[PDB]
Design an enzyme around this catalytic site. Structure first.
Site, short mmCIF file in Angstrom:
data_model
loop_
_atom_site.label_atom_id
_atom_site.label_comp_id
_atom_site.label_asym_id
_atom_site.label_seq_id
_atom_site.Cartn_x
_atom_site.Cartn_y
_atom_site.Cartn_z
N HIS A 1 -11.87 1.26 0.04
CA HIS A 1 -11.21 0.04 0.13
C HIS A 1 -11.25 -0.71 -1.09
CE1 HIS A 1 -9.53 -3.75 2.44
NE2 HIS A 1 -8.57 -2.92 1.97
N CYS B 1 -5.65 3.20 -5.56
CA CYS B 1 -7.07 2.80 -5.96
C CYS B 1 -7.08 1.31 -6.43
CB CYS B 1 -7.74 3.74 -6.67
SG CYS B 1 -7.81 5.33 -5.98
N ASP C 1 -5.39 -8.17 -0.56
CA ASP C 1 -5.67 -7.04 0.22
C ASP C 1 -4.34 -6.17 0.44
OD1 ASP C 1 -6.75 -4.99 1.71
OD2 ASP C 1 -7.50 -6.09 3.33
N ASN D 1 0.73 -1.24 -0.10
CA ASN D 1 0.07 0.02 0.06
C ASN D 1 0.85 1.34 0.11
OD1 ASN D 1 -1.69 2.07 0.56
ND2 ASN D 1 -2.59 1.26 2.45
#
Ligand SMILES: C[C@H](CC(=O)N1CCC(O)(Cn2cnc3c(Br)csc3c2=O)CC1)c1ccccc1
EC number: 3.4.19.12
Length: 356
Positions: A259, A18, A276, A13
């Site tokens: 998210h 996005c 994720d 991250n």
């Protein structure tokens, strides 16, 4: 960590990119694509400019790294270095940029044409005059399909709507040139469906009364197994258009600060993981599929977690699209160039702390 749990590593991250990390995993697990990518002759390339070399790096690290993989040199390479770049574009536009870049780099190589082979289908759009003898046919390639969601319960209904005949009459007659205004029918037909089918769901629709795009959180169902023969103009008895769900790209929230995650069953064997960013984890089929249908329109909660893009692979092509990738599919010259790249960045980090 997550490599040890699932066999698969995550992506860092790093700022707000996005839907990018979601899309990069999707493409990485399009194994035939990944192999062609390792084959691109990037010998001479600049690492902050070449999308092809930057992608090779990301894929190589996803295939070999035990720790989460960075994307800064990749985002720098195609120039999307702020939130705003990601806000100006649909997910398919990013995908088109990556695929165009690597397709162009495969020109004149042993692996030229991989991108259309995998992703390109053929359709024809038509306008047929009712009362006079005139027809306009526009044949077009596509690499993705944008499906209407609003007032549709499932993928079947979206495809039905996609190929529906529109009547051009009354106040919106067709300008038929020297035949003047004419009553007409307009539609689109599928001639072929590609081996790897990218479907975006049209949830981010313009709203006149707020003058903005708003995310529609309505229920929309998609199956594990998707038969599409009936939407083909001419079916093929030895290759029916039966598709298997590969990936479900999911968003939570009402804006680009929400998210983003992606669910995949990389081998097409119905065994799913949730990706994720840096955390890859095993999940149930139900978490990947039905729980991303959305709707649930239940008062205490705003339910805004759901699928915005789906990847299907044609059953007859599956073993070849998801053909396994071994160390032999990565040229030694590429492996050396990428190690050389890791050393040069390990030296730029030491030089950056010394000046501060
Ligand atoms: C707010 C957030 C923005 C975003 O990341 N995305 C913008 C929309 C996205 O591109 C899916 N998508 C793609 N082509 C379209 C078209 Br064409 C009309 S609406 C439409 C659409 O919806 C996925 C990325 C979002 C996420 C998921 C669903 C809806 C909104």
């Amino acid at each position: 960590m997550s490599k040890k749990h699932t066999g698969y590593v995550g992506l860092k991250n790093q700022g707000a990119t996005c839907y990018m990390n979601s899309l990069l995993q999707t493409l990485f697990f399009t194994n035939q694509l990944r192999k062609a990518v390792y084959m691109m002759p990037t010998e001479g390339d600049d690492s902050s400019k070449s999308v092809p070399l930057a992608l090779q790096r990301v894929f190589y690290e996803l295939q070999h790294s035990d720790k989460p993989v960075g994307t800064k040199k990749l985002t720098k390479s195609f120039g999307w270095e702020t939130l705003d770049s990601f806000m100006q574009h649909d997910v398919q536009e990013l995908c088109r940029v990556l695929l165009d870049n690597v397709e162009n780099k495969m020109k004149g190589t042993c692996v030229e044409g991989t991108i259309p082979k995998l992703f390109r289908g053929k359709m024809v759009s038509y306008i047929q005059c009712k009362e006079v003898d005139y027809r306009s046919d526009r044949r077009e390639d596509y690499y993705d399909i944008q499906l209407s969601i609003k007032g549709k319960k499932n993928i079947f209904e979206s495809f039905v709507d996609y190929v529906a005949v529109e009547q051009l009459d009354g106040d919106n007659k067709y300008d038929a040139g020297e035949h003047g205004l004419q009553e007409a029918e307009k539609g689109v037909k599928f001639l072929t469906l590609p081996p790897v089918l990218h479907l975006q769901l049209m949830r981010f629709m313009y709203d006149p009364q707020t003058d903005q795009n708003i995310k529609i959180n309505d229920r929309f169902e998609f199956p594990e197994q998707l038969p599409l023969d009936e939407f083909l103009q001419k079916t093929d008895p030895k290759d029916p258009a039966n598709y298997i769900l590969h990936a479900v790209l999911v968003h939570s929230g009402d804006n680009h600060g929400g998210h983003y995650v992606v669910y995949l069953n990389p081998k097409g064997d119905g065994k799913w993981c949730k990706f994720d960013d840096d955390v890859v984890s095993r999940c149930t089929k139900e978490e990947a599929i039905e729980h991303n249908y959305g709707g649930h329109d239940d008062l205490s909660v705003r339910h805004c977690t759901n699928a915005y893009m789906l990847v299907y692979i044609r059953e007859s092509k599956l073993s070849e699209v998801l053909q396994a990738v071994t160390d032999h599919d990565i040229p030694q010259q590429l492996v050396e160039r990428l190690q050389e790249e890791k050393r040069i960045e390990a030296q730029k980090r030491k030089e950056r702390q010394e000046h501060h």
